[PDB]
């Protein structure tokens, strides 16, 4: 069954270059055309590039013409996008998609074109008060770039979890909060650990959230 996995993303300085790779499985790679599509933050879907099975028909969007190059290694079941002379507006989530239809899309890989330095997050507990529903959380504060993944009890807790969209601060650093709501009488019965991962800074933190 169909698996598309994007990689090569992250932080890159303006003028810098990146090479994205999309590995594919569970279908005949050489029988389909492969698309790169991108999503600027809070904006809609933009087509970028397309390549036929034979690598004969290649098409680029006007925005990326001259700077980007698309290639496919049918042997390695891999689609590539070489991105040169990168600009701040190229900052977006990059997906590989299969066929004209767009029937299968990868998880997506985020590209941030910024002169700013990678900074790892500080994770701080949001401790529950004392009922009905009771709330606890983790404040993930002062990181760059996006994204951070937050889980609770290593994926064991999903019921009542809200991870909020990140906000950019005056510092030029991101902050988000993850909260979980539990029945008030279930406090100090279960253990609550927020697992924060910021790959761009090789930062993994497990913070225990206890009543204050």
């Amino acid at each position: 069954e169909v698996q598309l996995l994007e990689s090569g993303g992250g932080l890159v300085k303006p003028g810098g270059s990146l090479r994205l790779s999309c590995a594919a499985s569970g279908f005949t790679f050489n029988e389909y055309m492969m698309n790169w599509v991108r999503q600027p933050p809070g904006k809609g879907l933009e087509w970028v590039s397309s390549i036929s099975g034979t690598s004969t028909y290649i098409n680029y969007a006007d925005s990326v013409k001259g700077r980007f190059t698309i290639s496919r290694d049918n042997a390695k079941n891999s689609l590539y996008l070489q991105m040169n002379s990168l600009r701040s507006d190229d900052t977006a989530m990059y997906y590989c998609a299969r066929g004209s239809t767009g029937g299968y899309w990868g998880q997506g890989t985020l590209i941030t074109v910024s002169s700013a330095s990678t900074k790892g997050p500080s994770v701080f507990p949001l401790a529950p008060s004392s009922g009905g529903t009771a709330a606890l959380g983790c404040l993930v504060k002062d990181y760059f770039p996006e994204p951070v993944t937050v889980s609770w009890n290593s994926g064991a807790l999903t019921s009542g979890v809200h991870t909020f969209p990140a906000v950019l601060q005056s510092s030029g650093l991101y902050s988000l909060s993850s909260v979980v709501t539990v029945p008030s009488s279930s406090l100090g019965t279960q253990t609550y650990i927020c697992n924060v991962n910021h790959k761009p800074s090789n930062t993994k933190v497990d913070k225990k959230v206890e009543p204050k």
Partner: peptide, 16 residues
Amino acid sequence: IYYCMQATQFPLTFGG
């Protein structure tokens, strides 16, 4: 969010 996509003529285009 729902999108229409056209793939009849290049450039490939989507609704907003």
